[PDB]
Structures are given as C-alpha cells and as structure tokens.
Amino acid sequence: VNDNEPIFVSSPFQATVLENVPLGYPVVHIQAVDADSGENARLHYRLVDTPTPDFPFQIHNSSGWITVCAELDREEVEHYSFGVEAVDHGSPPMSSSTSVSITVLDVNDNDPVFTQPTYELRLNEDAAVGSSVLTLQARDRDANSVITYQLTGGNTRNRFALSSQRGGGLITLALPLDYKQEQQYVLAVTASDGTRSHTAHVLINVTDANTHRPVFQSSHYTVSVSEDRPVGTSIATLSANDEDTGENARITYVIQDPVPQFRIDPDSGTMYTMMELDYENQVAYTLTIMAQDNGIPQKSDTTTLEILILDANDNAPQFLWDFYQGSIFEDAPPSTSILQVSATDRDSGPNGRLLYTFQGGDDGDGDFYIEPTSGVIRTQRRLDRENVAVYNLWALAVDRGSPTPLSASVEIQVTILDIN
Ligand SMILES: [Ca+2]
Ligand SMILES: [Ca+2]
Ligand SMILES: [Ca+2]
Ligand SMILES: [Ca+2]
Ligand SMILES: [Ca+2]
Ligand SMILES: [Ca+2]
Numbered sequence: 001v002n003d004n005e006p007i008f009v010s011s012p013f014q015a016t017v018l019e020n021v022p023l024g025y026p027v028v029h030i031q032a033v034d035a036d037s038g039e040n041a042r043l044h045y046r047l048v049d050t051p052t053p054d055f056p057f058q059i060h061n062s063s064g065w066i067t068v069c070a071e072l073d074r075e076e077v078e079h080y081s082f083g084v085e086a087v088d089h090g091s092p093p094m095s096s097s098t099s100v101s102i103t104v105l106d107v108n109d110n111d112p113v114f115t116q117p118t119y120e121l122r123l124n125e126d127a128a129v130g131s132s133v134l135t136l137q138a139r140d141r142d143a144n145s146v147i148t149y150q151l152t153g154g155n156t157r158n159r160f161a162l163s164s165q166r167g168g169g170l171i172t173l174a175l176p177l178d179y180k181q182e183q184q185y186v187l188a189v190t191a192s193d194g195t196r197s198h199t200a201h202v203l204i205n206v207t208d209a210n211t212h213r214p215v216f217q218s219s220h221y222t223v224s225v226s227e228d229r230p231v232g233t234s235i236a237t238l239s240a241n242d243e244d245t246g247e248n249a250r251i252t253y254v255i256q257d258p259v260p261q262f263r264i265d266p267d268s269g270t271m272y273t274m275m276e277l278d279y280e281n282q283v284a285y286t287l288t289i290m291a292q293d294n295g296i297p298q299k300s301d302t303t304t305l306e307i308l309i310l311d312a313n314d315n316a317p318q319f320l321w322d323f324y325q326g327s328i329f330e331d332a333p334p335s336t337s338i339l340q341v342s343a344t345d346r347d348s349g350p351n352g353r354l355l356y357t358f359q360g361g362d363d364g365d366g367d368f369y370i371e372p373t374s375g376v377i378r379t380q381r382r383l384d385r386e387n388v389a390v391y392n393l394w395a396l397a398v399d400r401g402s403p404t405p406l407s408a409s410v411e412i413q414v415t416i417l418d419i420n
C-alpha cells in the first residue's frame with residue numbers, strides 16, 4: 001500500500017557552476033525521500049520544462065545527479081530556470097515537483113574588442129598641444145573584465161598621450177607636431193582586461209601648415225655700385241629661408257618703398273639698376289624689402305638694403321678763369337711768382353684731387369715752373385726782353401683718377417716789363 005509522496009531535501013534547488021566545467025561535471029544532487037519501502041519507495045527523477053537557446057544539463061534517472069552534458073557559456077546564458085519531478089514505482093504512483101535554478105559563473109575567456117575595426121585621421125601640423133585627437137572604445141563580453149588602454153608603439157618623439165578612462169581611451173597631443181620630422185604616425189593602442197589584450201593601429205597623417213615666417217640672411221645688407229654701371233646691372237641677391245613646405249615656404253620679394261632707380265626680381269630676390277646713377281647727385285639709397293611666403297594666411301619678414309654709390313672719374317678739371325695774364329720786371333730773380341692758377345673737379349677722392357703742371361703744356365723753354373699742388377707760377381731763370389717780351393704759357397690741371405686720368409689746359413700770358 002503506497003501511502004507516502006516523495007519529499008525533496010531542499011525546498012527549491014539552486015546551484016552556481018563556472019562556465020568552464022568539463023562535460024560530466026556534477027552540478028547538483030537532487031534528492032527525495034519516499035517514506036515507504038520496496039517499489040512504493042523507489043524513485044525515478046526527470047527534468048521538466050517550466051526558453052533559453054541551449055539546455056546543457058541532464059539528470060540521472062535513479063541517482064538524482066544533474067551533470068553538464070554540453071559545454072557552458074556565461075556569454076550565451078547566465079541563468080537557467082527549470083523543474084525536476086520525483087516519481088515512485090507505485091501501482092497508484094505518487095510524485096512531487098520543485099524548481100531548479102542554475103547560475104553560470106564568469107571566467108575570462110574573451111579578448112577585449114575595439115568597436116571600430118580600423119582607425120584613420122588627419123591632423124593639421126598646428127593642432128594645439130592638449131587638443132583631442134581620437135577616443136577609442138573596446139568592449140569585453142566577460143562581466144568581470146575592466147579595460148585599461150595603453151599607447152604601446154609608434155609614439156615617435158613622445159608626440160601623443162593616452163588617458164585610460166571608463167568610456168574608453170583618449171589620445172591627446174602631448175608635444176607639438178613638425179611636418180619636417182614626421183609626416184605620419186602609426187600608434188599601437190592595446191586594450192587589456194589585465195590578462196588578455198588586442199592592439200588597434202591609428203593611422204595619423206599630418207598636413208603642413210604655415211607655422212613659420214621667412215627669415216632674411218641679414219636684417220641689414222650693404223652693397224656698393226660704381227656710378228659707371230649701365231642700366232640693368234645686378235648689384236645683389238637678397239635671400240630669405242622658410243622652414244615650412246611648398247607655397248608655405250616659397251618666397252616673393254617686394255620693395256616696400258619703391259624708387260625709379262632700382263627694381264627687384266620677385267622670384268630670385270636679385271636687385272637690378274633701372275636708371276643711370278650719379279655720385280655727384282646722390283651717394284646712397286636705403287630700401288626696405290619684404291620677403292612674403294605664399295601660405296594661407298601669409299607671413300613675411302623685412303630687411304634694410306643700403307646701396308652705396310662709388311664715385312667714378314666722370315668729371316674733367318675746370319680752371320676758374322678761361323685765361324690768365326700777369327707781368328714781372330725783366331731784372332727779377334728766379335722763384336719770383338707771376339700768378340696762381342686754380343681748378344675745381346666735381347669728383348671726390350683721387351678723382352677730385354689736382355696736379356698743376358706744364359707737362360703737355362708750354363713753360364717758355366724752361367723759363368718758368370709751376371708748384372704741383374698750389375698752382376703758383378714762378379720764374380725759373382733770369383729773363384731777357386731782347387729774347388722774349390711776352391710768353392704764351394700753357395698750364396694743365398690733371399686729376400689722379402685711376403681707370404684713366406682727366407685734365408684741362410689754360411693759357412697764361414706773361415708780359416716782361418722794361419727797365420727805364
Ligand atoms: Ca511512496
Ligand atoms: Ca564563455
Ligand atoms: Ca575578458
Ligand atoms: Ca566569460
Ligand atoms: Ca612659411
Ligand atoms: Ca657723375
């Protein structure tokens with residue numbers, strides 16, 4: 001006579017299991033006590049449905065042990081809710097049912113995964129230090145995985161910085177860019193859960209910017225030019241150098257205060273004369289000159305050029321009087337002055353400095369001489385009106401001009417006065 005319903009040992013059943021356990025792992029012993037003996041007391045166990053995408057457990061129909069019969073995965077199903085039923089082999093058979101809960105415990109069996117498969121961007125070379133470059137996010141399907149981000153290769157000259165945070169991993173500019181040193185970076189970034197990792201690559205191209213001004217070779221050029229030089233003489237080649245690239249570094253030269261006498265070639269920075277120059281009119285010119293790059297926006301420098309005109313022997317001496325006349329008594333001793341000639345020369349230096357001489361002239365067959373620097377004409381000999389009563393002397397003023405010296409001549413008449 002079958003008088004007792006099978007009673008379970010725990011009120012409902014509950015168990016946890018690492019997602020790791022092998023096929024065969026004993027999860028829970030379901031136990032029931034029938035209060036009879038014989039077959040009135042003999043129990044069979046069965047799992048009942050009370051939807052999960054898998055059901056990786058089974059119960060042994062006599063022992064009551066639930067074992068894993070397919071590999072578990074917490075990232076597929078954390079929690080399984082189902083039932084178990086115990087039944088006696090009684091001719092009127094009795095049974096009871098309870099619930100079973102199995103919670104699956106997390107193991108670190110997933111790598112962190114970047115949210116983008118690929119990372120690419122373009123930075124302007126003048127991007128500010130501190131500015132944001134990129135935020136990278138990875139995710140880990142494990143519940144118990146904290147993600148730390150780290151810059152782990154290709155940070156050349158330590159240009160970039162990476163703050164690791166809750167959301168993800170922020171890249172900033174730590175130190176200034178320079179197109180002349182690096183056009184490109186390939187930053188490795190690794191996402192780690194503390195044991196597993198993945199490494200993303202960030203391709204960064206740098207666009208040259210106009211971060212430099214031309215710098216002239218000098219802030220004050222001085223060059224010299226003979227007043228001789230024809231129209232179209234090159235007199236100097238100014239240059240500025242710009243550390244940028246392309247148009248940002250290509251120089252246009254510009255006279256800021258133009259004069260008719262000079263022009264510049266804007267591409268080559270060469271200065272040419274545009275007119276005849278005259279030392280006797282202006283000895284010096286000063287120009288202010290710009291070098292502008294061709295960047296957007298444009299930058300520029302400034303220098304002064306001082307142009308010194310060099311004097312040329314382009315002026316001939318000129319006597320103050322076109323004719324001189326003087327007298328002396330016949331009985332006068334040697335070294336008696338008759339008179340002093342003078343000349344001027346509009347040139348300076350040796351070009352303007354004067355020698356008075358009878359050479360190329362006439363000194364009355366040696367009867368007179370002239371002092372080279374003073375121009376004073378003197379008797380050299382005793383005189384005789386029997387012989388010469390009236391000399392027609394010819395004096396020369398010669399400059400000391402190098403390339404070829406210039407001169408002028410003047411007539412001096414010398415009357416020899418009688419003795420009563
Ligand atoms: Ca029973
Ligand atoms: Ca798993
Ligand atoms: Ca993980
Ligand atoms: Ca896991
Ligand atoms: Ca520039
Ligand atoms: Ca002149």
Ligand SMILES: [Ca+2]
Nearest residue numbers: 311312314347
């Ligand atoms: Ca001159």
Ligand SMILES: [Ca+2]
Nearest residue numbers: 315347351399
């Ligand atoms: Ca002269």
Ligand SMILES: [Cl-]
Nearest residue numbers: 323324325326
């Ligand atoms: Cl006179």
Ligand SMILES: [Mg+2]
Nearest residue numbers: 071072073076
């Ligand atoms: Mg699976």
Ligand code: NA
Nearest residue numbers: 209210211244
């Ligand atoms: Na630049």
